Amino acid sequence: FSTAEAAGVKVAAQDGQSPISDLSVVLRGGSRYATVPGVSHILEKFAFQNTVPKSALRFVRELELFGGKLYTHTTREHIVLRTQFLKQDLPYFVDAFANVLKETKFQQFELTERVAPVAELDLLKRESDPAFTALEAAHEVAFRTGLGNSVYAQGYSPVTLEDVKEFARQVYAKQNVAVVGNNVVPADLQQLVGTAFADLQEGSKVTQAGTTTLHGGEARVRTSTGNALTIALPIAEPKPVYHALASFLGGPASMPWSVGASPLAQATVGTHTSVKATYHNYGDAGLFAITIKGDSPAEISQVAHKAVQALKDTGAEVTEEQAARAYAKSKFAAAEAFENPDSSASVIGMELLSGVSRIAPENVQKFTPAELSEAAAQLSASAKPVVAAVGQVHALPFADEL
Amino acid sequence: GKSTYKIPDFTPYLKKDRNTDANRLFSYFMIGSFGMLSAAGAKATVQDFLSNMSASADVLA
Amino acid sequence: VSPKTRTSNLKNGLTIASESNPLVQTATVGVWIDAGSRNENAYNNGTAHFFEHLAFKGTDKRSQHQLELDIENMGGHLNAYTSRESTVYYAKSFKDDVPKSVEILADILQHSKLAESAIDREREVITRELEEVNKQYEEVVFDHLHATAFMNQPLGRTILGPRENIQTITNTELRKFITENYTADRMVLVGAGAVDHDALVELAEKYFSHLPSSQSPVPLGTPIPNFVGSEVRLRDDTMPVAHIAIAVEGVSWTSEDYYTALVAQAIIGNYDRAVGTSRHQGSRLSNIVSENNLANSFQSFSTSYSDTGLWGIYLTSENTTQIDDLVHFTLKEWNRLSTSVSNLQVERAKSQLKAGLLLSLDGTTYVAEDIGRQLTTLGRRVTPAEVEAKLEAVTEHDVRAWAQKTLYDKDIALVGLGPIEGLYDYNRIRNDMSMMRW
Amino acid sequence: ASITSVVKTSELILKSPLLSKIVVPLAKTYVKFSGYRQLGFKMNDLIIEETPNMQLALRRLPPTESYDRVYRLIRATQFSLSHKLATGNDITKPEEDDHYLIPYILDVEAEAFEKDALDNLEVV
Amino acid sequence: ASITSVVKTSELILKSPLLSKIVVPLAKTYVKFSGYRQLGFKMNDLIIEETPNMQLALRRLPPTESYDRVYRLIRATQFSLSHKLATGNDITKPEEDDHYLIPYILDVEAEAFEKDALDNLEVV
Amino acid sequence: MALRKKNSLLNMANSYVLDSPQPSNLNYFWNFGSLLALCLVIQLATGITLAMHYT
Amino acid sequence: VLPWSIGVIIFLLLIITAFMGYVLVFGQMSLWGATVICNLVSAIPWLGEDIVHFLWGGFSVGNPTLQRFFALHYLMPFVLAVFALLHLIALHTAGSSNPLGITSNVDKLSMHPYYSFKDLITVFAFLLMFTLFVFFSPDKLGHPDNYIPANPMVTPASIVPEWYLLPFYAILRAIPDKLGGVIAMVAAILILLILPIVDRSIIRGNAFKPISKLLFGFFICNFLLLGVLGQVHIEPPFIVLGQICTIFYFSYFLILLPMVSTIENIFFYIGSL
Ligand code: HEM
Ligand code: HEM
Ligand SMILES: CCCCCCCCCCCCO[C@@H]1O[C@H](CO)[C@@H](O[C@H]2O[C@H](CO)[C@@H](O)[C@H](O)[C@H]2O)[C@H](O)[C@H]1O
Ligand SMILES: CCCCCCCCCCCCO[C@@H]1O[C@H](CO)[C@@H](O[C@H]2O[C@H](CO)[C@@H](O)[C@H](O)[C@H]2O)[C@H](O)[C@H]1O
């Protein structure tokens, strides 16, 4: 991805040999920057609504003629708007993004009838998985605000048209916008962005209201639709070793009809439960989480104990074999993330919008058994453990039990 | 008895040539014949019945 | 313009096919086999799926545990799936972990233990799978759809097989199945992503050279199905969403109407209330359904097999008093493929498909799946230029002629699951397959 | 006729100096003799509403405008059945006769008409 | 007639040795000639249900009993329209002809009749 | 919605002669109702015609 | 639109009912009115004469015609009652309109007791008018010639329909061609079916439309003048006047209402800006 600048907008493109191009606008407008709860989700859903030059209806009918597709999502850091089309149709897509950022008519009926109902279905689909809920709850406990804001719009706190219009006034500005073009000729994209995004406001960098503060605690989301448990450990100094530790501890199987050779995978033997360790770097803080879902609260409780033990055991000693297995699983995870268009866009988006240089999968550091065990030791000896239980919460573990 | 993927036995009723044009055409011949006799019967009925309104034999005399 | 698919053969008749992409760092290698559940009879139905479980249960060298460790140490993963006509076993890895992954795949296919102890253990796991598919409503609907459309025929059988067979499958019949079916002339070794073709051919010569050849080598994707107009109703008043599939007999992979059926399918298209753009789609059915809240979703499909296919639509709806309208309007849109479609809809669908067929291939696993599917169904990878030409050859006259012989006034296979009291009987549904005004 | 039609034709007239010079005074007298202001109505209260497009435009009115319209209709119905006219503050003054509904119906119709056009597009 | 009535009279007969000696054999032949078992029905499936009391009793059936009743009614309807009789396990055997509904309807009616009585109480 | 359901007049006919839900097991003795309707139609047609010629 | 369209058929049935009932007296006007009105069917091309003889049941109006008119006159009121019920059921979906032309969904009253008791006033006013004619002037609305028995030989001085059919008779006379005149006369009733289309107003009804109210006044008075011209002799200058009034009648539907309703739309919009 050759990083450049076109009319004040950071543009990164990588040419390829495929008939398919992906163009993504990455906006610094994720939920950590959200003025009011849920506004970044609503703004994401308000992309490709009526603009002054082109109605939502006309856009969709013309997109069907190009056979293009549209993908949008919100993270804690970004809003990502991606289009996938044939290479030759690049100018149309650039101009479409320009219309969205410059000329969206944010109309009250779109919010009531189109945008908010779709945002609500989006969230309900995600929450069907109790593990999603548990990991969301864990961020809320760990960070409270900023990273602790909900990503998604909720019913209890309604977003108004004035909320969304104000946020868009901040976000849709040259200072908060990065363009990422996969299989796009880099010189051609710079020329097009340079003409189309010239009259976009300059604006100012959106910032998190307040510094990131870490907290421990418990969340007990009582649902009737499945059971899950997250054990998170907030990290004050995000370090790349936690990727290796996440992949080492593992949890999912690398093979059909198997349990797996990872410590966390082996904690689920004899139970219909699954586990996944994940590490979330947010630049200024991190979260190391272990999420366990299952149908039995008794089995979840059983696995949860084994999971925290596994982490303690790792803090004791890692073998050389296990450290190499961690390097391999971690390099692979890095590679596939840079391939997947959704995650790819945000990776270069972070490089462009912040200044965090991307770590190429081929440059992923190999951590010795000493470095891995040291990282696990810090986590086992955390002052601020977070536990989010979802489901039959009376039957799930508590932080002080773990 | 228990599995719902084991279709009950329909072999006593199934025709082997069920997807053929000849198969459909036969049933439409029966439907068509019935429509044809209904049309010819309606026409005869209407014509004979409505003729009551034409000049009666005593008037034509 | 994508890089050329290179293809080589071995002496036994194993095909090697590759598409390199120097922009990615991962690679998907695997074995596509032209064999699946359809190759079983009634007594060993379930064997192919049973084997898939045992393939990962240990080989003559590596035990179950060693197998797990070896893959964990590679860094990527292995995956497998068995369908009616196709079995796949693949490995996604790093660029330079490809020789390891080819070696593991060659081992689990050729040299699997199939130990009585493991057969007995999986026999319970698979028995539990029988009572948990019940939740995957789309799969329940499609399995009943095949069972009824191809009543008492091999394509009508499920992949899991009956409970009875699961309890009686022996290592003997497992071994017999994979010896008869997993032959070199039925197999394709595929690599996509960061693979060198010449390197992959060498790995094939090293690991897959002692594969049996079949006695009578037919070409790849070589097959008589007699479709039954019929219905299965699985009424369940406690479910909130109705799931309905309606299909007619469709087209095989090598039909001359293959592209015509895809265009017709694209004219109806898909719809999902949860997606923001779906209320603005051009499809008439989409507009009717969204304006009247008739459905949560619908998905047109055109499934092909070697010698038949199913063409139809899958609908989901919570609108339980207007299922009649949903089915009525759907079938009246199908009628219009016979009576009313013109260059307006046909050229719009062609535009959408020319991109769609290329867009689908957006990662190494998708590319490998495309090379493998095309090689095992058509015997070759069809270039995008050829595909663009075949789509361009579809006219409105072709669509009308196809719909008049395939849809118009034809029997349907119909499956309803859930609160389907409002779904009318077979005759009233089938009467919507024609229009009295035409 | 569509509100779109009426609004476009009106704009052609209002552009032409000659046309506006002769039409605007007539239109003002017409409105005075029409007498809907003497029942406390605003012009837009009179537009036929039993149409999909109009039902959608009315649903998009802000709640305040919608509550006030309901009251004007009820009040006018009471004047009609009593054979009385509005007096005092119930009479709509020319400055209060605002086109509160026109922008909503124009947006509804814009989409409806674009949908009709796009349903007839021909790939070239 | 109410189920309560039928049940009470039946109990008077079953008490009397003489009466039961002559009535029980008649009742058993009656049931054999009635032929409802040959359509796979249980006796209680035949009771008229289009009354408030019976609708309430049916709503109080345990879910399994209720699902099984629905199947027996559907199956009997299919035998009726086909002009066939049940064969094999579809025939109701005398031991399967259980009074699954009688306790529910007797409770519903007990309350309904007590309500009628108490609506006519006279403070003494 | 289908016109036969949406339009109030069509819907009344629809409710009695088309979508009307019937038991699936009516026997031939349920056919006398429509025969009586047929007799009534024949009597109206023949009776009105006789009235044109009768004194 | 549906209750209105069924209403137009009710009006055609009422005309036929009343025409056949008038023949039943078999006085001079009965016979000669039947003759001239039934002969209009002879204008139907090719089969017209055959249809007339079929309607009459013979070669002129006579006993067969009278007996069939009695049977149909008895029947037609029942058909009329069914269509009257149909137009009310059709109306019930929208409810009654009201004099302001706006929705009444905001403010409804039960039909009873309010409109029951308001209907009694006009019932008693009607019964007073009924009483004055039936008891004090029972023959004011009739023709003396209908008290002379039908005589196929003697032709009455002037053969006119009953007063309520006179406007349609004037329209027929206006067109010189036989078939032309019949078409015009039927078109004069069927053209009511196009009012839903030719009225281009964005507002329902005339309460607030001064120009439409003037046009409606002229339309109604023209319809009354056509009535009067239906019973004058075919003499100057009533021949030309009948033609001018007929043009005015049709031009209301085809030209004036579409133009006036278009212009009023623009005046409402500009006038209230
Ligand atoms: C339920 C409907 C009807 C029934 C059961 C019925 C019954 C009868 C009977 C039994 C007769 C004696 C027939 C004879 O022996 O000659 C008759 C005669 C007659 N009916 Fe009806 N009728 C009905 C409807 C009508 C209607 C609607 C008319 C319309 C006028 C009518 C007109 C006549 C006439 C004119 C005669 C005498 C001529 C004759 O005997 O044929 N009927 N009717
Ligand atoms: C036997 C003749 C008729 C009867 C008994 C009849 C009866 C009625 C009644 C009771 C109503 C509701 C109350 C009212 O508004 O007055 C009504 C409304 C109506 N009728 Fe008639 N009617 C007849 C003939 C006609 C004719 C000939 C037409 C049209 C040419 C017609 C068109 C209508 C319309 C459009 C309405 C709705 C009016 C509204 O409330 O805004 N009717 N009719
Ligand atoms: C909307 C429907 C269209 C209009 C309906 C037509 C109404 C009347 C037209 C024909 C009626 C008279 O038409 C005439 O019918 C009678 C039968 O009824 C026929 O007469 C024929 O059969 C009758 C008895 O069945 C014999 O007495 C006669 O000798 C023989 O010729 C004539 O050959 C035919 O010319
Ligand atoms: C028999 C000849 C055919 C002509 C029809 C007979 C005329 C009688 C019809 C008028 C009587 C009113 O008839 C009444 O109509 C409504 C809708 O039409 C029916 O209503 C029924 O159907 C509609 C949809 O089909 C549903 O909204 C409703 O839940 C259901 O109850 C009533 O069950 C019926 O009683």
Residue numbers in the entry:
A (entry chain B): 15 to 416
B (entry chain E): 39 to 99
C (entry chain A): 26 to 248, 260 to 474
D (entry chain R), E (entry chain G): 2 to 125
F (entry chain C): 1 to 55
G (entry chain N): 111 to 383
What does the paper say about this structure?
Electron transfer within the complex occurs through the prosthetic groups of the three catalytic core subunits: heme b L and heme b H of cytochrome b (cyt b), heme c 1 of cytochrome c 1 (cyt c 1) and the [2Fe–2S] cluster of the iron–sulfur protein (ISP), often called the Rieske protein after its discoverer. The Rieske domain is tethered to the complex by one transmembrane helix and a connecting flexible linker that acts as a hinge.
(iv) +FCN: oxidized with potassium ferricyanide. Alternatively, the Fe–S cluster is positioned closer to cyt c 1 (the c or distal position). In the c position of partially reduced CIII2 (apo) His190 was within 3.8 Å of the propionic acid group, whereas it did not approach heme c 1 closer than ∼8 Å in the fully oxidized complex (+FCN).
